């Protein structure tokens, strides 16, 4: 049922409804001569929508807005990018031109600027120390500490028990570490354990790339990260 990388041409976006007013968005992109999928989140907030992450580039993000209008038909008024990489902020300018208020932590904004990636406009305060949580409308934002990147956020939807782990969490099909150029390998498992301790009620866990699962994706990611650590 969940849209897979094989099913989505680059440039197109699928939505997957998880619960009343919660969807993931799934897009694909060429990377390393392969095609990889990438997930974001959409959460209804009243008669508006909160978007979590771009769809990995401007073209895809335009497709994302069009698919949202087609399938849901409510305005995206805010967006949060969960780290500074292009699968999270690539498309921010598209969102901004469409009237979306884009947000990220100051950590993410600083790193995006250094990197030459798009920079969300608004700053999310209160997330700079490991273990910090803040409410943002229908979600809670949580900074678990450095993992896939120094700035990685996770997002929890309490009404639906959905934990969006972003790229700090790997899908089960990934058995070897991926892009760790910006990672903190030493802290990554500790950061995962903070997610487990903060959201032990989570029922649906979404990795940055690939198929959702349950909280077992946390242990899985720790297993893979520790194996890479011991390479």
Nearer to Zn ion, 12 or 87 (CB): 87
User: Hey, is 82 helix, strand or coil?
Assistant: coil
CB of 71 to ligand MCO, least distance (A): 25
- 156 close to 202: Cβ distance less than 8 angstroms: yes
Residue 25 known to be catalytic: no
Contacts (CB under 6 A) with ligand MCO, residues 99-128:
none
Q: In this chain, which residue has its C-beta nearest to Na ion?
A: 133
User: Hey, is 123 helix, strand or coil?
Assistant: strand
| Cα R_g (the chain), whole angstroms | 16
Q: How many residues bind ligand MCO (CB under 6 A)?
A: 10
Residue 132 known to be catalytic: no
166 closest CA partner among 145, 184, 176, 152? 152
CB of 63 to Zn ion, least distance (A): 18
Q: Is 151 in the site for ligand MCO (CB under 6 A)?
A: no
Q: Does 85 belong to an annotated binding site?
A: yes
Backbone phi and psi for residue 204, each to the nearest 5 degrees, phi listed first? -130, 120
Given 39, 53, 60, 85, the catalytic residue:
85
Distances (CA, A) of 198 to 12, 43, 85, 144: 35, 20, 25, 9
Residue 178 interacts, among Zn ion, Na ion, ligand MCO, none and using kind-specific CB cut-offs from 5 to 8 Å, with ligand MCO
Site string for Zn ion, 178-217 (x = CB under 5 A): ------------------------------x---------
Contacts (CB under 5 A) with Na ion, residues 95-134:
133
Go through the chain and tell me how many residues it has: 231
Identify the residue among 35, 72, 74, 101 touching Zn ion (CB under 5 A): 101
- Tell me the C-alpha distance between 226 and 231, whole Å: 9
Q: What region, left, alpha or beta, does residue 26 occupy, with left being phi > 0 and alpha being psi -120 to 50 degrees?
A: beta
Backbone phi and psi for residue 49, each to the nearest 5 degrees, phi listed first? -125, 140
- Residues marked active site are found at 83, 85, 87, 148, 179
Q: Which residues bind ligand MCO (CB under 6 A)?
A: 31, 36, 85-87, 167, 178-179, 208-209
Q: Which residues bind Na ion (CB under 5 A)?
A: 133, 140
């Amino acid at each position: 049922e969940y849209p897979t990388v094989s099913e989505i041409p680059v440039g197109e976006v699928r939505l997957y409804q998880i619960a009343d007013g919660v969807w993931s968005h799934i897009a694909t992109q060429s990377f390393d001569g392969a095609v990889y999928p990438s997930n974001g989140l959409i959460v209804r907030d009243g008669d508006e929508l909160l978007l979590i992450d771009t769809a990995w580039g401007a073209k895809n993000t335009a497709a994302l807005l069009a698919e949202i209008e087609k399938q849901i038909g409510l305005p995206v008024t805010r967006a949060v990018s969960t780290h500074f990489h292009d699968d999270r902020v690539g498309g921010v300018d598209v969102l901004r031109a469409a009237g979306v208020a884009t947000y990220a932590s100051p950590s993410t904004r600083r790193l995006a600027e250094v990197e030459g990636n798009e920079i969300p406009t608004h700053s999310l305060e209160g997330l700079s120390s490991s273990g910090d949580a803040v409410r943002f409308g229908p979600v809670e934002l949580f900074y678990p500490g450095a993992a896939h990147s120094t700035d990685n956020l996770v997002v929890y939807v309490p009404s639906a028990s959905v934990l969006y782990g972003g790229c700090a969490i790997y899908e089960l099909s990934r058995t070897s570490a991926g892009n760790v150029a910006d990672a903190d390998l030493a802290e990554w498992p500790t950061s995962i354990e903070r997610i487990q301790q903060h959201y032990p009620e989570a029922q649906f866990v979404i990795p940055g790339h690939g198929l959702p699962g349950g909280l077992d994706l946390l242990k899985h990611t720790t297993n893979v990260v520790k194996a890479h650590t011991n390479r």
